Design a protein around this ligand. Structure first.
Ligand SMILES: [Mg+2]
Ligand SMILES: [Mg+2]
Ligand SMILES: [Mg+2]
Ligand SMILES: [Mg+2]
Ligand SMILES: [Mg+2]
Ligand SMILES: [Mg+2]
Ligand SMILES: [Mg+2]
Ligand SMILES: [Mg+2]
Ligand SMILES: [Mg+2]
Ligand SMILES: [Mg+2]
Ligand SMILES: [Mg+2]
Ligand SMILES: [Mg+2]
Ligand SMILES: [Mg+2]
Ligand SMILES: [Mg+2]
Ligand SMILES: [Mg+2]
Ligand SMILES: [Mg+2]
Ligand SMILES: [Mg+2]
Ligand SMILES: [Mg+2]
Ligand SMILES: [Mg+2]
Ligand SMILES: [Mg+2]
Ligand SMILES: [Mg+2]
Ligand SMILES: [Mg+2]
Ligand SMILES: [Mg+2]
Ligand SMILES: [Mg+2]
Ligand SMILES: [Mg+2]
Ligand SMILES: [Mg+2]
Ligand SMILES: [Mg+2]
Ligand SMILES: [Mg+2]
Ligand SMILES: [Mg+2]
Ligand SMILES: [Mg+2]
Ligand SMILES: [Mg+2]
Ligand SMILES: [Mg+2]
Ligand SMILES: [Mg+2]
Ligand SMILES: [Mg+2]
Ligand SMILES: [Mg+2]
Ligand SMILES: [Mg+2]
Ligand SMILES: [Mg+2]
Ligand SMILES: [Mg+2]
Ligand SMILES: [Mg+2]
Ligand SMILES: [Mg+2]
Ligand SMILES: [Mg+2]
Ligand SMILES: [Mg+2]
Ligand SMILES: [Mg+2]
Ligand SMILES: [Mg+2]
Ligand SMILES: [Mg+2]
Ligand SMILES: [Mg+2]
Ligand SMILES: [Mg+2]
Ligand SMILES: [Mg+2]
Ligand SMILES: [Mg+2]
Ligand SMILES: [Mg+2]
Ligand SMILES: [Mg+2]
Ligand SMILES: [Mg+2]
Ligand SMILES: [Mg+2]
Ligand SMILES: [Mg+2]
Ligand SMILES: [Mg+2]
Ligand SMILES: [Mg+2]
Ligand SMILES: [Mg+2]
Ligand SMILES: [Mg+2]
Ligand SMILES: [Mg+2]
Ligand SMILES: [Mg+2]
Ligand SMILES: [Mg+2]
Ligand SMILES: [Mg+2]
Ligand SMILES: [Mg+2]
Ligand SMILES: [Mg+2]
Ligand SMILES: [Mg+2]
Ligand SMILES: [Mg+2]
Ligand SMILES: [Mg+2]
Ligand SMILES: [Mg+2]
Ligand SMILES: [Mg+2]
Ligand SMILES: [Mg+2]
Ligand SMILES: [Mg+2]
Ligand SMILES: [Mg+2]
Ligand SMILES: [Mg+2]
Ligand SMILES: [Mg+2]
Ligand SMILES: [Mg+2]
Ligand SMILES: [Mg+2]
Ligand SMILES: [Mg+2]
Ligand SMILES: [Mg+2]
Ligand SMILES: [Mg+2]
Ligand SMILES: [Mg+2]
Ligand SMILES: [Mg+2]
Ligand SMILES: [Mg+2]
Ligand SMILES: [Mg+2]
Ligand SMILES: [Mg+2]
Ligand SMILES: [Mg+2]
Ligand SMILES: [Mg+2]
Ligand SMILES: [Mg+2]
Ligand SMILES: [Mg+2]
Ligand SMILES: [Mg+2]
Ligand SMILES: [Mg+2]
Ligand SMILES: [Mg+2]
Ligand SMILES: [Mg+2]
Ligand SMILES: [Mg+2]
Ligand SMILES: [Mg+2]
Ligand SMILES: [Mg+2]
Ligand SMILES: [Mg+2]
Ligand SMILES: [Mg+2]
Ligand SMILES: [Zn+2]
Lengths: 70, 126, 206, 50, 50, 119, 87
RNA sequence: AAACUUUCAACAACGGAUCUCUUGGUUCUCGCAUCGAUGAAGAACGCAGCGAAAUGCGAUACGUAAUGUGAAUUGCAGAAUUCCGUGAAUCAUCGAAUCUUUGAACGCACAUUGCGCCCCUUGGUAUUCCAGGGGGCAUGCCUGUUUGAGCGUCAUUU
RNA sequence: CGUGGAGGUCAGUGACGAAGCCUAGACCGUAAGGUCGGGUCGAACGGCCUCUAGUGCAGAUCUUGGUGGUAGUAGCAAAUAUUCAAAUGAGAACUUUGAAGACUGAAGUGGGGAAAGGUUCCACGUCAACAGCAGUUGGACGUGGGUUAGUCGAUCCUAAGAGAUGGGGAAGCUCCGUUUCAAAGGCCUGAUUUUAUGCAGGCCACCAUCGAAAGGGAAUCCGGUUAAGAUUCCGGAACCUGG
RNA sequence: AUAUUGGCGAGAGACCGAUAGCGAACAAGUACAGUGAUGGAAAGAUGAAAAGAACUUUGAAAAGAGAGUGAAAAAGUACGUGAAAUUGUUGAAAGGGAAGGGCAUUUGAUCAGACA
């Protein structure tokens, strides 16, 4: 949550068949947002996690509580 | 006695099929016989008990008591009556589980289909 | 047959301070180390294990079978025996019991029953029934589960629905003269059934 | 294993014989079927003989 | 480790999951018999062999 | 309440593909709520419905194809009858019924007579 | 040194998990599995090892397809759909 | 005389015999003929509102469609619209689908979530670079198709 | 004499208590054994005539399980060493913290990795079992959190090796061979401006592939930041490869 | 017409009755051992129904003591019966380097029958 409050990062658990490309686009397409980069990692339980930085125009935090969570 | 060839009087197989039997089959095993009253009425002896049905425990300790079948607990092979219950030490209450075969039907919840069942066993209805 | 033996146990030989039945090998599992094959080890094979090719059935001399069944028949007269052998005949007309041939044709249990009663059966049918008991053994759960005394055996000549009338009544067995079964003529090798013969039947004997 | 005044028997159970042992437990269950399957032929094969 | 295949990363993860205790509601079902997780695994007691 | 089977099968081709899109949105939204609540069984019946949709989007397009191919030598193996591998290469009635010329000439000539004894 | 010291050096797999049967029986250097026999065409069986077999024969598994073949058979391999009735 | 040792008893311990049970195992018998390149058996990994397993399923994941039944499911929470009804159900039946990663396993590899080729399509200012979406490319052999080879060899040119 | 099971019989006994177990109580038998009382107990069981066998235990270094005397015994003695006090807690020789006494002595008991483990990491909760005293502590238990890369590895390369392929052996699983008595392939554009790619040159004869987280190898750094991640994030500043 | 320790579906038994019967009546080819080929267990029973003990009290707790449930807690998720070895308390007795045994009787404890 601090990534979102501090970093402008949207953390998503993501499909393991998906790459940085497919993640970036299918975020762009699903939330109407512009993305900087997509650092990812495989959680120790078998789920890809996505660190996702939006560009300076979007305040991820505002996005976060407009998608639903907070 | 079993004069057929596709029926078994073997005690093992019997008790398996009882206990393992699926829900759809259980409905039929959980039958109650109609009341002397309801019997001359629909011209019919027994019937697969169902929910919003009315009943008289004509056996057991709960003899005489009567009510609406709250739920049929196929899983537990037992029926529950809304009105016949246990008040625990902590005063909270809990359902007793009556067996269909020890009940008697008093008023039949009726359906298009309940009707058809009754009509099919050679019954009649008022 | 393959049982006792689904192991791999070799002995351990002498000298390891322990007895020398073969022993399960390997490790990590309790079973590991224990006795095999031994007719005295747990999970052994059993000594001289039963076979299918036992002599089950017996060849009896065809002619004795007769002399037997015959003898069996002669005693179902003989008052004393029929009496001695169970069978409340304490007070039936005459031995042998000969009923009408009309019996052979009676077609409803309920009918037959009270016919048989009139002929004197009653006390005997009642003697069964008063006697269904739970098989003492384990046939109690090998579908040999109940048990009860033997009733009258009604021999007929032509079956015109008698057998299906008397089927459901407990103790009463039926038989056409042309057969006649030594297992029913002296059940348990005890001489003197309670036989009730239709006349047409009776007359077929010679 | 020669002893007493018996005959000399020649019983051939030295191969692995316990393996090839045909009990005809089904003597009955073959008659029946044979009967059952003769009847179906009469039936099938029209008013013809067997 | 500390540089393993996904193939192993994976087994390791499945491994992790099964290492939980019997969810205490299963115990309360009808006819339940399972008292405890009889299949549990501890890292310094039994090794899983890749 | 869920969606239904027949109610879909009349819904239009891209009415149908549309509903799927909106179901997947429902799901998305739900999976958010799921983690912010001690329970959400509701989810079970929306993901159940997506199935039904896809199921019917498939059924229709399939016997769309199944028919254009209906009535010609060669149609996709997955529209072909499954039966059994061996069944699927047993001789066809015809190539089995196949008698020789010389043969039928005799079958015809001397066929099995329905005779009978008695008199 | 042939005991508890020489076991010190044990930390090098002879087998990894075999792809065909997932068993940790895949001989790395010898590149075959010691149980199933991958990558051989046939699966490895032996008649002197039956408990071996019994640990793998059809039925030990999911039977993903084979389950239903007796049913499918039971009704003569029914191409088609079912109609409708009453009640 | 205690204590202690020993013996009998009562009660209580330890242990799990015995008695009685049995959805199991064994043996007999009858009937029947159906795995797979239309991807089998087997593997792995995942799938539930709350599951680790057994069972079941396959990113449509304890299931979708269909048909029969005619009201449950049940440990809790639940929808509630589902009750004179295209309709409850962890039901039965099953003819329709979905069916990850693999396996004879088939583009090549594989102690690698490793590495290419082709067609269609979409975005990036692109026949050619990158990315997303679909559909493809193993081997032996048979019938045929088409394109070819050899002074093996026939004819035909002027 | 006695046991499991079968045929017959006693219309046998029994929830008003069958079976079983206890019983320095009673009785019958030379004995094997049989019968009763009482206590415990909960669904079955017995007499007589016959039938049947996986039919009687003290041993077999017998099998499996269970249990003793040994015995509160042997023992818990290697690796210099501990101490005062507070805090917490039902509980403190043993946990937290402050003090003091010491050690390892940079060939470390320091600071990191390779193999191997797999979550042990970190937080919170927490003592039934475990840590051969203890336990308020732990690598334990319950519960959550945590592993971010164009440049760091894999990936690519080839080594010893491994091993398909045309083939050659072998009844056959399969053995031999690796460029091998093999018709073994793909690149640059031009020819297109029907049009998409047929052919117009020429080369090129290399004939798989696997095989190195220490060999070969394109390219990154410093400061900051976390309960737990960093040459992977933040910040600033670069560099390589492709287009 | 023959075969059939496999497969799908059935009916059976003078069979075994949880140390037996298939190794497995149970989440058994499981858990666990081995580098591997392989090896491979133990483990069924509260009651009719959880009515699975509110509440009070001692305790840090586990628990104990009351209460309560039930036909029975002499059924309390250590759960039907609950043998033996072996153990605690209680009662009785004997014991100068074992103990047990045989015949006989004293003494103590205990008991049948029998009379009318
Ligand atoms: Mg901000
Ligand atoms: Mg009916
Ligand atoms: Mg009364
Ligand atoms: Mg009931
Ligand atoms: Mg043998
Ligand atoms: Mg010894
Ligand atoms: Mg055995
Ligand atoms: Mg009896
Ligand atoms: Mg008995
Ligand atoms: Mg011979
Ligand atoms: Mg003939
Ligand atoms: Mg170990
Ligand atoms: Mg539904
Ligand atoms: Mg075809
Ligand atoms: Mg070792
Ligand atoms: Mg090696
Ligand atoms: Mg090899
Ligand atoms: Mg292969
Ligand atoms: Mg004694
Ligand atoms: Mg006691
Ligand atoms: Mg027993
Ligand atoms: Mg019972
Ligand atoms: Mg059986
Ligand atoms: Mg039969
Ligand atoms: Mg197999
Ligand atoms: Mg599973
Ligand atoms: Mg389940
Ligand atoms: Mg549910
Ligand atoms: Mg309908
Ligand atoms: Mg189903
Ligand atoms: Mg799909
Ligand atoms: Mg391959
Ligand atoms: Mg791949
Ligand atoms: Mg593709
Ligand atoms: Mg050709
Ligand atoms: Mg040609
Ligand atoms: Mg005797
Ligand atoms: Mg006996
Ligand atoms: Mg026996
Ligand atoms: Mg007496
Ligand atoms: Mg008593
Ligand atoms: Mg008693
Ligand atoms: Mg009982
Ligand atoms: Mg005898
Ligand atoms: Mg014996
Ligand atoms: Mg002896
Ligand atoms: Mg003994
Ligand atoms: Mg001894
Ligand atoms: Mg002994
Ligand atoms: Mg011992
Ligand atoms: Mg002590
Ligand atoms: Mg000491
Ligand atoms: Mg010492
Ligand atoms: Mg020291
Ligand atoms: Mg200390
Ligand atoms: Mg300190
Ligand atoms: Mg110093
Ligand atoms: Mg030094
Ligand atoms: Mg240290
Ligand atoms: Mg480190
Ligand atoms: Mg480790
Ligand atoms: Mg954890
Ligand atoms: Mg820690
Ligand atoms: Mg403690
Ligand atoms: Mg520890
Ligand atoms: Mg300790
Ligand atoms: Mg302690
Ligand atoms: Mg933990
Ligand atoms: Mg990464
Ligand atoms: Mg580098
Ligand atoms: Mg790469
Ligand atoms: Mg080779
Ligand atoms: Mg390589
Ligand atoms: Mg390298
Ligand atoms: Mg730093
Ligand atoms: Mg972080
Ligand atoms: Mg660190
Ligand atoms: Mg940066
Ligand atoms: Mg910059
Ligand atoms: Mg450039
Ligand atoms: Mg046979
Ligand atoms: Mg058979
Ligand atoms: Mg039969
Ligand atoms: Mg057993
Ligand atoms: Mg026995
Ligand atoms: Mg066993
Ligand atoms: Mg069971
Ligand atoms: Mg175990
Ligand atoms: Mg019980
Ligand atoms: Mg028990
Ligand atoms: Mg129970
Ligand atoms: Mg108490
Ligand atoms: Mg009692
Ligand atoms: Mg009890
Ligand atoms: Mg309790
Ligand atoms: Mg008990
Ligand atoms: Mg004396
Ligand atoms: Zn394998």
């Amino acid at each position: 949550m601090k990534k979102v409050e501090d970093g402008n990062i949207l953390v998503f658990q993501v499909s393991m068949k998906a790459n940085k490309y497919q993640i970036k686009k299918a975020v762009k397409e699903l939330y109407e947002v512009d993305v900087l980069k997509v650092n990812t990692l495989v959680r120790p339980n078998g789920t890809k996690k996505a660190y996702v930085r939006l560009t300076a125009d979007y305040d991820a935090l505002d996005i976060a509580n407009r998608i639903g969570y907070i | 006695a079993k004069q057929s060839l596709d029926v078994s009087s073997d005690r093992r197989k019997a008790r398996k099929a009882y206990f393992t039997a699926p829900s759809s089959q259980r409905r039929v095993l959980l039958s109650a016989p109609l009341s002397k009253e309801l019997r001359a009425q629909y011209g019919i002896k027994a019937l697969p008990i169902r929910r919003d049905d009315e009943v008289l425990v004509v056996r057991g300790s709960k003899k005489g008591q009567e009510g609406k079948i709250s739920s049929v607990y196929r899983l537990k092979f037992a029926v529950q009556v809304d009105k016949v219950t246990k008040e625990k030490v902590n005063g909270a209450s809990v359902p007793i589980n009556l067996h269909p075969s020890k009940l008697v039907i008093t008023k039949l919840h009726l359906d298009k289909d309940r009707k058809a069942l009754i009509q099919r066993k050679g019954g009649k209805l008022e | 047959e393959k049982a006792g033996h689904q192991t791999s146990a070799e002995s351990w030989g002498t000298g390891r301070a322990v007895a020398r039945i073969p022993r399960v090998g390997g490790g990590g599992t309790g079973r590991s180390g224990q006795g095999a094959f031994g007719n005295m080890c747990r999970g052994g094979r059993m000594f001289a294990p039963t076979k299918t090719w036992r002599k089950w059935n017996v060849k009896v001399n065809h002619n004795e079978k007769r002399y037997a069944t015959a003898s069996a028949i002669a005693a179902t007269a003989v008052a004393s025996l029929v009496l001695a052998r169970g069978h409340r005949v304490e007070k039936i007309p005459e031995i042998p019991l000969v009923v009408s041939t009309d019996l052979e044709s009676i077609q409803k249990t309920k009918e037959a029953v009270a016919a048989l009663k009139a002929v004197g059966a009653h006390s005997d049918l009642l003697k069964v029934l008063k006697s269904k008991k739970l098989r003492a053994g384990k046939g109690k759960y090998r579908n040999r589960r109940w048990t009860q005394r033997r009733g009258p055996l009604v021999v007929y000549a032509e079956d015109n629905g008698i057998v299906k009338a008397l089927r459901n009544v407990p103790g009463v067995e039926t038989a056409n003269v042309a057969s006649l079964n030594l297992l029913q003529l002296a059940p348990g090798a005890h001489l003197g059934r309670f036989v009730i013969w239709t006349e047409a039947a009776f007359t077929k004997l010679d | 294993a020669i002893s007493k005044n018996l005959p000399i028997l020649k019983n051939h159970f030295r191969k692995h014989w316990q393996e090839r042992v045909k009990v005809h437990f089904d003597q009955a269950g073959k008659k029946v079927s044979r009967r059952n399957a003769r009847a179906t032929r009469a039936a099938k094969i029209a008013p013809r003989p067997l | 480790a500390a540089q393993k295949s996904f193939r192993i990363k994976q087994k390791m993860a499945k491994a992790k999951k099964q290492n939980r205790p019997l969810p205490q509601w299963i115990r309360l079902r009808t006819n339940n018999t399972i008292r405890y997780n009889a299949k549990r695994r501890n890292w310094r007691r039994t090794k899983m062999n890749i | 309440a869920g969606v239904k089977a027949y109610e879909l099968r009349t819904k239009s081709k891209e009415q149908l593909a549309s509903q799927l899109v909106d179901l997947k949105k429902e799901l998305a939204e739900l999976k958010v709520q799921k983690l912010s609540r001690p329970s959400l069984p509701k989810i079970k019946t929306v993901r159940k419905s997506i199935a039904c949709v896809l199921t019917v989007i498939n059924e229709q397009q399939r016997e769309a194809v199944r028919q254009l191919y209906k009535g010609k030598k060669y149609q996709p193996k997955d529209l072909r009858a499954k039966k059994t591998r061996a069944l699927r290469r047993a001789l066809t009635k015809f190539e089995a019924s196949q008698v020789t010329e010389k043969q039928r000439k005799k079958q015809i000539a001397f066929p099995q007579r329905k005779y009978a004894i008695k008199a | 040194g042939k005991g508890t010291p020489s076991f010190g050096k044990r930390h090098n797999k002879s087998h990894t998990l075999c792809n065909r049967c997932g068993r940790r029986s895949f001989h790395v250097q010898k590149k075959t599995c010691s149980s199933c026999g991958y990558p051989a065409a046939k699966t490895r069986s032996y008649n002197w090892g039956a408990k071996a077999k019994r640990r793998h024969t059809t039925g030990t598994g999911r039977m993903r397809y084979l389950k239903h073949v007796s049913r499918r058979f039971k009704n003569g391999f029914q191409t088609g759909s079912a109609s409708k009735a009453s009640a």
